[PDB]
Amino acid sequence: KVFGRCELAAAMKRHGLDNYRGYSLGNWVCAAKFESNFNTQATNRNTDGSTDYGILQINSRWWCNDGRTPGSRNLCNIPCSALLSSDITASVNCAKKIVSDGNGMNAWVAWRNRCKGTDVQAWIRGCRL
Ligand SMILES: [Cl-]
Ligand SMILES: [Cl-]
Ligand SMILES: [Cl-]
Ligand code: NA
């Protein structure tokens, strides 16, 4: 699924991401925009053989199991394929774990480089939430 901006903002809110760990909703939508362009079936292979999965490009090095990332962990206890569903629950649930991990949203390199310190609230502007 390719979500709409405001559609995703709503879903994210419903799933409890708004101010989750201090991070306003706009931060999560901006991250999804630049990670996956709002597409739940986004995958991107990393140079180290790990792959990033779904709306928030969650990486198999640490967070999910795809059976092809040697020496990796599955800290979210999911198959990575769960991160590709039209239903964002598993993505959101794993992201709570990642953003709680200590570096906050800097875990998402695109959030750091493209969203951090920006008017992120623009991404939820005029959305019925
Ligand atoms: Cl699609
Ligand atoms: Cl693996
Ligand atoms: Cl933080
Ligand atoms: Na893994």
From Swiss-Prot:
Pfam families: Lys
Taxonomy, superkingdom: Eukaryota
CDD domains noted in UniProt: LYZ_C
Coiled-coil annotated residue ranges, if any: none
Coarse class of the protein's main subcellular location: secreted
Keyword Signal: yes
Compartment list: Secreted
Broadest EC class assigned to this enzyme: hydrolase
SUPFAM superfamilies (alphabetical): Lysozyme-like
Record-annotated disulphide pairs: 6-127, 30-115, 64-80, 76-94
Keyword Signal: yes
Active-site residues (renumbered): 35, 52
GO BP terms in the entry: cell wall macromolecule catabolic process; defense response to bacterium; defense response to Gram-negative bacterium; defense response to Gram-positive bacterium; killing of cells of another organism
Alphabetical keyword list: Allergen, Antimicrobial, Bacteriolytic enzyme, Disulfide bond, Glycosidase, Hydrolase, Secreted, Signal
GO function terms (MF aspect): beta-N-acetylglucosaminidase activity; identical protein binding; lysozyme activity
Gene Ontology cellular component terms for the protein in this record: cytoplasm; endoplasmic reticulum; extracellular space
Entry's EC annotation: 3.2.1.17
Residues reported in the UniProt entry to bind substrate: 101
Reactions listed under catalytic activity: Hydrolysis of (1->4)-beta-linkages between N-acetylmuramic acid and N-acetyl-D-glucosamine residues in a peptidoglycan and between N-acetyl-D-glucosamine residues in chitodextrins
Expression across tissues: In the egg white and polymorphonuclear leukocytes.
Subunit: Monomer.
Function: Lysozymes have primarily a bacteriolytic function; those in tissues and body fluids are associated with the monocyte-macrophage system and enhance the activity of immunoagents. Has bacteriolytic activity against M.luteus.
Family the entry assigns: Belongs to the glycosyl hydrolase 22 family.
Note: Lysozyme C is capable of both hydrolysis and transglycosylation; it also shows a slight esterase activity. It acts rapidly on both peptide-substituted and unsubstituted peptidoglycan, and slowly on chitin oligosaccharides.
Protein name from the UniProt record: Lysozyme C
